[PDB]
Design a protein around this ligand. Sequence first.
Ligand SMILES: C[n+]1cn([C@@H]2O[C@H](COP(=O)(O)OP(=O)(O)OP(=O)(O)O)[C@@H](O)[C@H]2O)c2nc(N)[nH]c(=O)c21
Length: 179
Amino acid sequence: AHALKDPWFLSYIPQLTPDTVKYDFWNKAKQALQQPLDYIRTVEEFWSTINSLPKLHQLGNGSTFIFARNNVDASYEAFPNGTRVLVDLYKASVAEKGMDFVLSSVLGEGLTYDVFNGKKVCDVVRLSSRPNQESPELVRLEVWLSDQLYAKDVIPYIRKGLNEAGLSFTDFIMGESTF
Ligand SMILES: C[n+]1cn([C@@H]2O[C@H](COP(=O)(O)OP(=O)(O)OP(=O)(O)O)[C@@H](O)[C@H]2O)c2nc(N)[nH]c(=O)c21
């Protein structure tokens, strides 16, 4: 048992699509569909959980995994000055290598000490299945930041780390969406 800097709570939202929300209503929809999965406290639980995750593409379009630091609410409302760094991974093979890199960088405080100078700017990581006509295995990763200013630093850091983990320029695309 080797404790993480902070424990992270893993939740699941099945087939969370904007069209399913259109009949439901966000908090009314989130609290009604969210399923608790695990409370990750140590490195050993981190790898057990990550290596046991069911494939996002075998679950519906919009199936989402949320990793929340200290079990905080993963709401747009809670991060007014924040942003979402996006990573879209095209194939199932690259999605695993990418997901492993990003989650290890976040829960392992790699981003904290390499980019944020010791500040805990990232409190949420979201993993979504988002297949489109063109790419049916497309998985989206979201690195939620409390401060938008850090996005310019997180994007090249994540790009380099994915490239180093063996992903090519065509295996993933970097993006950003504000709150
Ligand atoms: C997590 N979340 C989801 N929604 C709503 O739920 C819908 C589906 O939720 P989503 O999380 O699948 O959309 P996402 O932002 O990833 O996709 P994109 O914006 O199309 O790139 C969204 O379109 C919102 O209307 C949300 N709406 C608000 N206000 N706040 C939230 O925290 C929030």
